[PDB]
Write an enzyme that holds these catalytic residues in place. Structure first.
Site, PDB file in Angstrom:
ATOM      1  CG  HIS A 342      18.836  53.435  23.505  1.00 37.59           C
ATOM      2  ND1 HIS A 342      17.875  52.486  23.780  1.00 37.59           N
ATOM      3  CD2 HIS A 342      19.836  53.231  24.394  1.00 37.59           C
ATOM      4  CE1 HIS A 342      18.277  51.740  24.795  1.00 37.59           C
ATOM      5  NE2 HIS A 342      19.464  52.171  25.185  1.00 37.59           N
ATOM      6  CE1 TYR A 456      20.096  48.728  33.730  1.00 35.20           C
ATOM      7  CE2 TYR A 456      22.161  49.724  32.986  1.00 35.20           C
ATOM      8  CZ  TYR A 456      21.082  48.880  32.765  1.00 35.20           C
ATOM      9  OH  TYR A 456      20.990  48.176  31.587  1.00 35.20           O
ATOM     10  CB  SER A 458      25.551  49.651  30.796  1.00 37.88           C
ATOM     11  OG  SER A 458      25.278  48.946  29.596  1.00 37.88           O
ATOM     12  CB  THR A 469      22.992  45.393  27.885  1.00 39.97           C
ATOM     13  OG1 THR A 469      21.589  45.695  27.927  1.00 39.97           O
ATOM     14  CG2 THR A 469      23.634  46.108  26.696  1.00 39.97           C
TER      15      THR A 469
HETATM   16  C1  LIG Z   1      14.068  50.634  32.615  1.00 40.70           C
HETATM   17  C2  LIG Z   1      15.540  50.272  32.409  1.00 40.70           C
HETATM   18  C3  LIG Z   1      16.404  51.528  32.273  1.00 40.70           C
HETATM   19  C4  LIG Z   1      17.881  51.164  32.106  1.00 40.70           C
HETATM   20  C5  LIG Z   1      18.757  52.402  31.896  1.00 40.70           C
HETATM   21  C6  LIG Z   1      20.235  52.011  31.832  1.00 40.70           C
HETATM   22  C7  LIG Z   1      21.123  53.165  31.358  1.00 40.70           C
HETATM   23  C8  LIG Z   1      22.597  52.758  31.400  1.00 40.70           C
HETATM   24  C9  LIG Z   1      23.507  53.776  30.702  1.00 40.70           C
HETATM   25  C10 LIG Z   1      23.238  53.828  29.198  1.00 40.70           C
HETATM   26  C11 LIG Z   1      24.205  54.781  28.489  1.00 40.70           C
HETATM   27  C12 LIG Z   1      23.982  54.779  26.976  1.00 40.70           C
END
Ligand SMILES: CCCCCCCCCCCC
Ligand SMILES: CCCCCCCCCCCC
Ligand SMILES: CCCCCCCCCCCC
Length: 625
Positions: A342, A456, A458, A469
């Site tokens: 990631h 949330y 993205s 992002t």
């Molecule tokens: C503390 C912030 C956490 C944000 C998590 C977002 C996840 C979104 C989907 C990601 C898929 C790869």
């Protein structure tokens, strides 16, 4: 006749010098947007307290921190205000990268059944991947660009012109044709890169000079060149030979698979790596760290989509080097996927890599199922890496395994394929397909658990220099109102009333989507102000100590869409213990979702409700009650 899978007339990085800077919102807008997102989550009393904290923040410390943030940004116009802090957050995190952060994307099968032979596909996927590497490094990969009207902007005619415009003004050229070039500063980390565990913050390592591939099978490590010293890709038939050699190894799984270590807490792994080096394994670790990427050959077929998801998301812990920029996995039945680390990027590079490799390996395969492995001494060309493990290291691997199995055993994943309709039907109803999918998630959660929670979605701000992002907040007063109408008070509402409520959800969601892509969300801004406060050694402002803020950042519903003809399925674990990790895709005639959950939630039941809600939404849109 060359080793490139693309020959761009426009240099790959042609638009990088002229990309617009990531804007910073006005503090007044952010506070308002933050409050808007809190409306559906807080009760009146909680909201009043939070609104008061916002007013104070905007006029007090917040105003001050914002000034510093703007001043800092002006001193660093070569980057974005969010990139550094974001990298710092993930490299500093000490949690296991498996499940918590690493996601996966699975390839669709090669349309030609026969080409899905493990040896054949592993060879073709590997060759295409190296061809991508060569193309990218040669600057022959077409620049990443988002076209509003491809038929006018993505043409040779435009390419022949922009090609003569200097990098300092190229962005404007594309802008005039409604084309938006994207940032590509992360793409180099796709290859010869890895994440190295270190005491307080990890480091991203890259060795562009390495030319070997790392292959994992039954927990054993193997390396062999895929690029010779002349810079050409090694003969596909020779690569096939070396992979056939690896696939023929009969050695049983090691009693202590070293790969388990990459799944540990970062401080624990950082120390164990130090011991590994102290015990003389530095040369071996350097080979692992610098390989172009890691190819994992699993010796079993995929039983179901659920088994596939588990295999590609985490596997059994012995056959994945989680730290690598990415792991290309190919199962016994040819099923292939990419599991990636990631922290090094936002995944746009991986998706581009993914799509090009799928296209190149299926349309112009390097070898066929009838291809004859070239004659060669594989035992000499392929090196089997060995690790000198002390008692402490074996104890370490054992502990890593117990921790891994413990966590993985709590993970559940499942998917659904809603086949009544998709983008086509929804667009005719003049609704945003993405807004409808999100509305369904909200509605399903209300039906299943009776509450509205932090959500949330993205979104990419890659249209800006070093853009990353931004967070789209789909849980709004509109989705809450609409969900309540569909779930709580059906009948009490006319079909017409339900239709306009969905229209309201779609409209607001489109507004948030556009703002987010433009860097006008509130999450990154508020995070940057907090990061700066901490950097200034200042006490965390009350705005952040507010339980409402912590709740806004405990994303029970985590979602991300993925649209690609190369992708069969994708997924990621939930980001909080009591959350869902939702990967979805709205197609022209159907809708797919792959949902994960831990012990606290039920992904299977959730999906049943999502199915139910999508059916209710489609009925209402069709004038049915
Ligand atoms: C503390 C912030 C956490 C944000 C998590 C977002 C996840 C979104 C989907 C990601 C898929 C790869
Ligand atoms: C201007 C908006 C550009 C968006 C470019 C596509 C981003 C896709 C992200 C995929 C992550 C896996
Ligand atoms: C037909 C291949 C499997 C499709 C499974 C349904 C879709 C799952 C979600 C994908 C999100 C990227």
């Amino acid at each position: 006749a060359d080793d490139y899978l693309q020959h761009s007339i426009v240099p790959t990085m042609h638009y990088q010098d002229s990309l617009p800077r990531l804007p910073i919102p006005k503090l007044e807008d952010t506070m308002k947007r933050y409050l808007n997102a809190q409306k559906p989550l807080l009760d009146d009393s909680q909201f009043r307290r939070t609104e008061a904290l916002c007013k104070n923040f905007e006029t007090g410390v917040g105003k001050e921190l914002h000034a510093h943030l703007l001043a800092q940004d002006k001193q660093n116009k070569h980057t974005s205000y969010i990139s550094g802090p974001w990298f710092d957050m993930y490299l500093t995190a000490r949690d296991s990268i498996v499940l918590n952060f690493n996601p996966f994307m699975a390839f669709n099968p090669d349309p030609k059944s026969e080409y899905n032979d493990q040896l054949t596909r592993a060879t073709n996927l590997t060759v295409s991947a190296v061809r991508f590497l060569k193309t990218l490094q040669a600057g022959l990969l077409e620049p990443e660009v988002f076209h509003l009207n491809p038929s006018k902007s993505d043409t040779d005619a435009f390419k022949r012109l922009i090609r003569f415009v200097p990098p300092s003004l190229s962005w404007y050229g594309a802008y005039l044709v409604n084309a938006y070039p994207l940032d590509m500063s992360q793409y180099f980390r796709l290859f010869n890169s890895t994440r190295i565990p270190r005491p307080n913050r990890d480091e991203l390592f890259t060795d562009t000079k390495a030319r070997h591939l790392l292959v994992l099978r039954k927990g054993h490590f193997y390396v062999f060149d895929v690029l010779d010293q002349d810079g050409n890709i090694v003969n596909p038939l020779e690569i096939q030979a070396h992979l056939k050699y690896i696939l023929s190894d009969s050695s049983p799984v090691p009693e202590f698979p070293v790969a388990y270590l990459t799944s540990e807490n970062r401080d624990v792994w950082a120390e164990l790596r130090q011991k590994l080096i102290f015990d003389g394994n530095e040369e071996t670790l350097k080979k692992v760290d610098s390989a172009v990427f890691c190819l994992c050959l699993d010796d079993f077929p995929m039983k179901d989509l659920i088994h596939l998801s588990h295999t590609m998301l985490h596997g059994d812990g012995t056959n994945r080097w989680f730290d690598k920029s990415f792991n290309l996995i190919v199962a016994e039945d040819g099923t292939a996927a990419v599991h990636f680390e990631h922290s090094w990027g936002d995944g746009v590079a991986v998706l581009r890599f993914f799509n090009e490799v799928f296209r190149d390996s299926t349309q112009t395969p390097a070898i066929t199922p009838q291809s004859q492995p070239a004659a060669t001494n594989s035992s000499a060309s392929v090196e089997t890496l060995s690790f000198n493990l002390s008692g402490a290291l074996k104890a370490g691997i054992t502990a890593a395994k117990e921790k891994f199995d413990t966590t993985v055993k709590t993970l559940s994943i499942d998917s659904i394929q809603f086949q009544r309709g998709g983008k086509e039907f929804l667009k005719k109803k003049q609704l945003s397909p993405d807004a409808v999918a999100q509305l369904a998630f909200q509605m399903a959660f209300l039906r299943q658990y009776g509450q509205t929670v932090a959500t949330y979605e993205s979104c990419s701000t890659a249209a800006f220099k070093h853009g990353r992002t931004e967070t789209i907040r789909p849980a709004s007063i509109f989705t809450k109102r609409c969900s309540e109408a569909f779930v709580r008070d059906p009948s009490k509402h006319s079909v017409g009333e339900l239709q306009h409520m969905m229209a309201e959800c779609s409209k607001y969601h489109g507004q948030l989507t556009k703002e987010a892509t433009m860097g006008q969300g509130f999450d990154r801004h508020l995070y940057a102000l907090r990061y700066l406060a901490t950097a200034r050694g200042l006490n965390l402002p009350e705005l952040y100590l507010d339980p409402a803020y912590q709740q806004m950042n405990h994303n029970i519903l985590s979602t991300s869409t993925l649209n690609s003809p190369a992708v069969s399925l994708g997924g990621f674990a939930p980001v909080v213990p009591d959350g869902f990790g939702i990967a979805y895709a709205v197609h022209d005639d159907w809708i797919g979702c792959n949902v994960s959950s831990y012990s606290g939630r039920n992904a299977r039941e959730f999906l049943h409700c999502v199915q139910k809600c999508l059916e209710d939404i489609f009925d209402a849109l069709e004038g049915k009650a």
